[PDB]
Amino acid sequence: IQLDDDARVFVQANMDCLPTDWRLVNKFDSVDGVRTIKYFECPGGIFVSSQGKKFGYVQNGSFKEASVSQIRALLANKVDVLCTVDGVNFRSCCVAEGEVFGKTLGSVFCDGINVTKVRCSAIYKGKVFFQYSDLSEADLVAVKDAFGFDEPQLLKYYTMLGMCKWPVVVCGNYFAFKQSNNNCYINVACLMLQHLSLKFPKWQWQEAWNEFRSGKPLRFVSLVLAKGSFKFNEPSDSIDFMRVVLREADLSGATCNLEFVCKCGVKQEQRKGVDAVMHFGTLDKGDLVRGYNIACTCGSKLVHCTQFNVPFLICSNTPEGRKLPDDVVAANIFTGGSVGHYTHVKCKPKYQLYDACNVNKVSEAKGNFTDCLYLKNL
Ligand SMILES: [Zn+2]
């Protein structure tokens, strides 16, 4: 015949199999004077047709040339979806069935999955679609309000959401991440965060945290990796991850009084929030009260905490072998060597080692500990 490849495909496909809503025409007509072959009749008074080799449709009395995709879209049931950039304001949009979402929506995620190249279907009806390309200044304001991100951070977030497909499994009363991409610093950090009650002012963070608490941490993890300077597949410190998390949380009630003494002189401060609950340079809470030394330009500062008003404490240090202080609830261990694996112990009632996705009663654990969590006697 003389039809275009696509058009030939479409026309002779639905020839040896004429669909339900249709009707075989197969006739000649004179539309706007021009000889036109009408192939089929479709709902809405549309006749899929050809003016020789040009392809299209007749509606009312006019012929319009159109791609097989445009026709296929015109005949299809439209699906309505909710588009947003921040998960706070939404607009309903229609997308042709069988068509690719990306065409009309730009880059999009749905339920944590990139669907920029998925083909539309009634299953997506009423689903939320997150857009993130071609963002106006208003959009970026919205994003800064709901995510606390700028544009590069947002793009990083969707990138991580794409790449971080780590299975998460149940281990006793906790969850843990299958090991890959040097993710154990994330694993032990989250094992520690699972003991904590937190709320987050920014909506996307609170929502992600709710999923986290219900055993679905990947979204939240992706937010954290986006907020910080973490690189996929690159090992980092558990304490950094925890710090980013806690910097995002509402810890306004948490304070403590600190005193420093060194050659530079004498300083007294009240630290608030994350600064009140995270401490570096000792693993022992008791040292915070009795005083301990950290390194400084002048050599070494003496550090003393005189007042605590905190929901919990995390004391961290460069990895060291030592007997665990008496009140520790959970701890991170950095086991060096060539690479550098992280594992985690919980102390009560059973002293237990969490390593990837296994749990075993501890027989002997000498170190090297890097983070200790305290919930009582503060
Ligand atoms: Zn000094």
Swiss-Prot record:
Binding site for Zn(2+) 3: 262, 264, 296, 298
Active site residues per record: 184, 341, 355
Compartment annotation: Host membrane
Zinc finger (C4-type): 262-298
Domain Peptidase C16: 146-378
Catalytic activity: Thiol-dependent hydrolysis of ester, thioester, amide, peptide and isopeptide bonds formed by the C-terminal Gly of ubiquitin (a 76-residue protein attached to proteins as an intracellular targeting signal)
Domain Ubiquitin-like, residue spans: 76-131
DPUP domain residues: 5-77
Mode of membrane association: Multi-pass membrane protein
Function: Responsible for the cleavages located at the N-terminus of the replicase polyprotein. In addition, PL-PRO possesses a deubiquitinating/deISGylating activity and processes both 'Lys-48'- and 'Lys-63'-linked polyubiquitin chains from cellular substrates. Participates together with nsp4 in the assembly of virally-induced cytoplasmic double-membrane vesicles necessary for viral replication. Antagonizes innate immune induction of type I interferon by blocking the phosphorylation, dimerization and subsequent nuclear translocation of host IRF3. Also prevents host NF-kappa-B signaling.
Identification of the protein by name: Papain-like proteinase nsp3
Organism of origin: Murine coronavirus (strain A59)
Phylogenetic classification of the source organism: Viruses, Riboviria, Orthornavirae, Pisuviricota, Pisoniviricetes
Recorded name of the encoding gene: rep
